Design a protein around this ligand. Structure first.
Ligand SMILES: *[C@@H]1O[C@H](CO)[C@@H](O[C@@H]2O[C@H](CO)[C@@H](O)[C@H](O)[C@H]2NC(C)=O)[C@H](O)[C@H]1NC(C)=O
Ligand SMILES: *[C@@H]1O[C@H](CO)[C@@H](O[C@@H]2O[C@H](CO)[C@@H](O)[C@H](O)[C@H]2NC(C)=O)[C@H](O)[C@H]1NC(C)=O
Ligand SMILES: *[C@@H]1O[C@H](CO)[C@@H](O[C@@H]2O[C@H](CO)[C@@H](O)[C@H](O)[C@H]2NC(C)=O)[C@H](O)[C@H]1NC(C)=O
Ligand SMILES: *[C@@H]1O[C@H](CO)[C@@H](O[C@@H]2O[C@H](CO)[C@@H](O)[C@H](O)[C@H]2NC(C)=O)[C@H](O)[C@H]1NC(C)=O
Ligand SMILES: *[C@@H]1O[C@H](CO)[C@@H](O[C@@H]2O[C@H](CO)[C@@H](O)[C@H](O)[C@H]2NC(C)=O)[C@H](O)[C@H]1NC(C)=O
Ligand SMILES: *[C@@H]1O[C@H](CO)[C@@H](O[C@@H]2O[C@H](CO)[C@@H](O)[C@H](O)[C@H]2NC(C)=O)[C@H](O)[C@H]1NC(C)=O
Ligand SMILES: *[C@@H]1O[C@H](CO)[C@@H](O)[C@H](O)[C@H]1NC(C)=O
Ligand SMILES: *[C@@H]1O[C@H](CO)[C@@H](O)[C@H](O)[C@H]1NC(C)=O
Ligand SMILES: *[C@@H]1O[C@H](CO)[C@@H](O)[C@H](O)[C@H]1NC(C)=O
Ligand SMILES: *[C@@H]1O[C@H](CO)[C@@H](O)[C@H](O)[C@H]1NC(C)=O
Ligand SMILES: *[C@H]1O[C@H](CO)[C@@H](O)[C@H](O)[C@H]1NC(C)=O
Ligand SMILES: *[C@H]1O[C@H](CO)[C@@H](O)[C@H](O)[C@H]1NC(C)=O
Ligand SMILES: [Ca+2]
Ligand SMILES: [Ca+2]
Ligand SMILES: [Ca+2]
Ligand SMILES: [Ca+2]
Lengths: 386, 386, 386, 386
């Protein structure tokens, strides 16, 4: 049966570890894909890890990072959560160098973008069958979430960006039913910048927390109903969630220009005026990870926080991170449980290898005892191929 | 339930990318079969990639291409679409050095031809159980589609050739129910030459577009009803569909003798007087691929065209290509969707290796926005074993 | 539903190739078990390949044939027919250095013998659960079929041997329901010798064709009803079915002493006074394979034959061979279809390697066009490990 | 449906071999995890082998045993019984360096403990969904069974220890329904020491046989009803069950201090005043294994016994061992069948390698004929990586 999506988020005091795949450790000898963007999404039966690959395995010559991000070889694929991304346990999903995926309760929806930078096409599959497409409307690198879309009552929702990572781009929200786009709207957001949105349902509404690559070191957000009537803003907290970023001062409800260029895929959970912020430990590099609870960090600008839980050690490698949810139809709970994944990037540019790949850890929000720690990748680099 | 097969082909203005397995890139380290003829066919539940193997893996000594094409080691096998053809994810189908496969809605039908050059036997399996055999009637390399067969109303249909690739041969159309041959007819086609037919259903009828290895650089066709009452011809378009071929001149509704010797497996879709032609970019070798819409190419002789969409770049390796359809019982559409696959041949004879294998890309016909590009194999040759 | 087993064997004029796994060819690089005794058995849903392994893979040091046949490491395992015996696609069945398996229509029965030579225990599993055991009654290498047992109307049947391979041993027939032995009888067979019986159902009765290791170069048989009331004899045909054997003279309805010592696992199909004999092409070594039809070879002693079909070339490697059937509950036929498998042994003692393993080919009996040929192993020995 | 758990243990006169995975032998070439604690547990449909991994494979550099036992990389995973623990056939369960698992009849319950030594958290999953957490209450290495938990009437039960392995610690019994902790009680057991409990159901009650790492060379026990009303004691038999241990003298119903320091995970089955003791053959190291029936060993102090059955030879490697049961809902029997597994440890500290891993053999209790033998690991050490 289709997901209702009408209950609020679960109250969450801590994050319990849910999975760890040890991809790069195992891939040293085993046949494991070189991957990026290991996002998680759940059906009413299971939870899956989606990822992007150049069609190359670790410790092989083809893992040579000479190929561009947006290449003809890049594919979206999925494996069971906690298992390694192997050609022997992965479903092929779509040919894509930018992707999104979500289950409406009946079938899997996957959004795969491929093609040239000046005319990329996003191909929509529902139950493995192509059901719709969209072409680039600004002819400048059509790109999407790199994490799960959000589904409420048989409609799934996503956000796409067309334009520069450098300045003003064009941002669109989409409403999708059974793989077919039934409504879309462009966001009136001058001076804002949206990339790689983490989106989730909450009381029949979707909230996305994204990445400003232009001039924001805090995170932009967009929230909308099913008719795509939206509000936009930035996370006001002085606890800045992007990377790179400055040290924590008083925040802003607009874009924080200080160290605002570049960014990393991220997420955050809104609870009234409060926010659960997932971010790196390092302000300048992709090192460490921590969950921080600010009871007024959504609308307030002060840099005060009450709860902080360690996820990845300051000296260890992290990277991309995204939100994912588990619905009452899967858990049997009365609310929608918030969860998150972290990509643990190893190799270039930070380390002396010829390749780059990411590990995967994930955590679920629970209202019971938890603990801070460090769950890093664990691979000993460089590898045999280097 | 049985596939009805009584609706028209879907109107198609473009081709969206459906799959890419990157199998040769992955097969550098991974345990992937050395394959040829990666044809796709679909059940009402899934789509599968069938292929032929010498029973050898990439980067192994057994992949040494000294063994003849019609060896006793050759086997037909299948794997899920977009995944690598590996011994760990492949389903064994039949012992064959020539094959065809299709799903009637209830069960899989596979046709595997093996045996000596002068007395080959086609073994027919319905649901993996041997249900019939056909013996070579002209004692000269009995051979079939290397592509999916077509099914209508609980009957599946195929074309088989017995005789030389050098001149006049014998061609038979077959009607199959539950894996049993219920009716066959020999085609009365002097001066014609049919090999490796790409066949598809359309309004309760089957259309095959084949390969003239004798004296034709345009593609021969045959079409028939359920009682096997047939018509024959060639594609009249000046846009020549075979390889090798001459440059585009005024076409012919018979065989075009210019560079008509030899060829490559191919396909085309008929829409009234018009034709969707898929072909290589080079006229001499198997390089590049493109889709061309000629509104008057089926029956008209001129070499004008409306639409052209790139698939594989001019300097990139292509090879075999074939058609497959998706029935409304799979898609929920009102028509039968045309799709196609391309084999991307790497190694001998063109490249300095000891082996030869094909990669896989597939596309499906949509009436929404698409884009031309190049989706090539991508493996760095030679390999360790070379 | 449970197999009736009450119809007669299918009339068979020829043998169509059913499978070929190319194990040793693929195992050169891939992770494939070193195997012996690749027998086939079928459930109403599928057909499976069972095999014995020392728990070692090809091209690995552990494949060193220093270990004895009846060791603690030997396990019975099964993989889908035509697929390679890999740790990634094989079900574990039982710890055994001698085995049998059959499906009664409801669940799998497996018989696994392990333990010391002077007190071996056969463990009976039904649906993976241990349901019964038998201990060695003569304390001399308790051993069984090395091929499928036979099931008629919810009772499965097998034959076990306890005693010397050198002279008179003890032979017992068993009746098994839901994995539990409900009746057994000892065979009153002085001067006879039974090892490695190939057994099949036929009109509610079981016929086994076995291997005389003592002093018979023709094959002994035993046939019985469901109450285990049995008849015994030898195949009278001058076309001798064992290996080693003499050249074809006039036969005997008793044991043929000439070249009677040693033997090979084999099979034969009784049709009234006639017999389908499967045997090697070489009289002294395990080379080649052929099917021979003698219209009076069961009860008559003359060495005349009307039909002969080549399976494996005279210069190629063969080995063990067994019978298997497909019931009307699987095929939809009115009779029980006879089929057979051949093990293609490579390595020691015949070849200069450190190991020994077998390939697998199988054939089904059909009443339509067939052909003789040679489908050999195909591996290039010696391997890297040697 | 829920497992009733209200019948008695089956009467058992011997142990028949159930499985052997030969994983270290296969892992020489194959891609097999370096594992510890290969405990077995059964659903009403299948039996599975759970295990812990550092996320490393055999013959890889990552298998370097310098990483601590309670690392962040440690994960609980499962595979079908008798198959190798491979990344290609293993199901991810939880992130854990200490674990327990059981099936209540409806769904799998897994318990995975991870986190820092001073604040470990037990994460409970029902059907793969986090349902509860328990935090370390004594802040000293919270740890559990390393063996299956026991389920009765839709409730599952486990034992957890918090405190030193050096002296007095804290021990708690837990009652779990649908993955939620409904009741727990602390054991009032001064002078006692419980670790790594092997627990099983019997007539609506649970009996655990554990490891005294403090000052006991005989095994401690605890037993309780559904309300967790418990009894405690030690196994009085002079046949000592732990390792290290002294030679068999007069026993004690309290802790036997002689060689009582340290130990190994083990199990035993209670039958009234009698006990089935599984133990190592050596008294100093982890070598050999045997089953012993002492008709008065549970409550009596003498060191006499009736039955003894060999499992692993005196000079062969053994290690951890634990109990698992098969309920009547799986077997169709009238009682609850006792079974057990043995871990076969190869490598450090005993052997000159860089790694440590365990093999797996399992046995089930039958009332029919059995035989003593030796079923050892069998791998030739050292390996290429050593
Ligand atoms: C990865 O790719 C790079 C770029 O193609 C390779 O760099 C080459 O290194 C050799 C050194 O002998 C030079 O001769 C080439 O000219 C380099 N190429 C370029 C474009 O500068 C590198 O060898 C590759 N690494 C692999 C395959 O492991
Ligand atoms: C194609 O054939 C299908 C199935 O044979 C037709 O659907 C049937 O149409 C008849 C006509 O009244 C109905 O009685 C049945 O209820 C239909 N069956 C199903 C399964 O739908 C369909 O009409 C045909 N379409 C055409 C002719 O275009
Ligand atoms: C592939 O097979 C061919 C032919 O069997 C091998 O070529 C041989 O190479 C030798 C020199 O090493 C030459 O004398 C001949 O041309 C070939 N021999 C024969 C008997 O034809 C080639 O070595 C093989 N490649 C492999 C196994 O990697
Ligand atoms: C297979 O096993 C045999 C027997 O153990 C090994 O033979 C040994 O060969 C070496 C040669 O240096 C001798 O030193 C040993 O004494 C031999 N053993 C015996 C019992 O004679 C052989 O090396 C093994 N092959 C492998 C592991 O590949
Ligand atoms: C063990 O418990 C089972 C299930 O609770 C008992 O079986 C039930 O017994 C009651 C008693 O009349 C019947 O009403 C039900 O029909 C039974 N249910 C099932 C599923 O069989 C069983 O009696 C108990 N066995 C004992 C007490 O030894
Ligand atoms: C396993 O890990 C250990 C410790 O990290 C490695 O041992 C090192 O070896 C060097 C000499 O090569 C010695 O100086 C030290 O004893 C160790 N170094 C450190 C920093 O502790 C060992 O090489 C590793 N084995 C592998 C990777 O195979
Ligand atoms: C959520 O939706 C379901 C189905 O529409 C409804 O039954 C339920 O009352 C809703 N829950 C709310 C509004 O809390
Ligand atoms: C929920 O689903 C029903 C069923 O289609 C739909 O009609 C209704 O609009 C929905 N309610 C929402 C979206 O709140
Ligand atoms: C075989 O058995 C079935 C069920 O017992 C019966 O219906 C059928 O008549 C039998 N076939 C024969 C005797 O030919
Ligand atoms: C076939 O099965 C029935 C059902 O159990 C049995 O009663 C009868 O004896 C059988 N008939 C045979 C074995 O011919
Ligand atoms: C074919 O479909 C069924 C199967 O034979 C038959 O009943 C029906 O009349 C036929 N329909 C056609 C030929 O369109
Ligand atoms: C436990 O089983 C069910 C579940 O609570 C309950 O109805 C029944 O009364 C109980 N039976 C016992 C404790 O034996
Ligand atoms: Ca930024
Ligand atoms: Ca041609
Ligand atoms: Ca003999
Ligand atoms: Ca102790």
């Amino acid at each position: 049966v289709k997901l209702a999506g009408n209950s609020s988020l679960c109250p969450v005091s801590g994050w319990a570890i849910y999975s760890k795949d040890n991809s790069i450790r195992i891939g040293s000898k085993g046949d494991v894909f070189v991957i990026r963007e290991p996002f998680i999404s759940c059906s009413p039966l299971e939870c899956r890890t989606f990822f992007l690959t150049q069609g190359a395995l670790l410790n092989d010559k083809h893992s040579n990072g000479t190929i561009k991000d947006r290449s003809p070889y890049r594919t979206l694929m999925s494996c069971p959560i906690g298992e390694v991304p192997s050609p022997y346990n992965s479903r092929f999903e779509s040919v894509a160098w930018s992707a999104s995926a979500c289950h409406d309760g009946i079938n899997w929806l996957t959004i795969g973008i491929s093609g040239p930078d000046n005319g990329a096409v996003a191909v929509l599959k529902y139950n493995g069958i192509i059901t719709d497409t969209i072409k680039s409307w600004r002819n400048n690198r059509l790109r999407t979430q790199e994490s799960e879309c959000a589904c409420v009552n048989g409609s799934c929702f996503t956000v796409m960006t067309d334009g520069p990572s450098d300045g003003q781009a064009s941002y669109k929200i989409f409403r999708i039913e059974k793989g077919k786009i039934v409504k879309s709207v462009e966001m009136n957001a001058p001076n804002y910048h949206y990339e790689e949105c983490s989106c989730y349902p909450d009381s029949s509404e979707i909230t996305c927390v994204c990445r400003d690559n232009w001039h924001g070191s805090n995170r932009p957000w967009v929230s909308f109903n099913q008719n795509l009537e939206y509000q936009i803003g930035y996370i006001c907290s002085g606890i800045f969630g992007d990377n790179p970023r400055p040290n924590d001062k008083t925040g802003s409800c607009g874009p924080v220009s200080s160290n605002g260029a570049n960014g990393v895929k991220g997420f955050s959970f809104k609870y009234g005026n409060g926010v659960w912020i997932g971010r790196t430990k390092s302000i300048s590099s992709r090192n460490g990870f921590e969950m921080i609870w600010d009871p007024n960090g959504w609308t307030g600008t002060d840099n005060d926080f009450s709860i902080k839980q360690d996820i990845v050690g300051i000296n260890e490698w992290s990277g991309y991170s995204g939100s994912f949810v588990q619905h009452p139809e899967l858990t049997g709970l009365d609310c929608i449980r918030p969860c998150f994944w972290v990509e643990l990037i190893r190799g270039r540019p930070k380390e002396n290898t010829i390749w780059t790949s990411g590990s995967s850890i994930s955590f679920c929000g629970v209202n019971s005892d938890t603990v801070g720690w460090s769950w890093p990748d664990g691979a000993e680099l460089p590898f045999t191929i280097d």
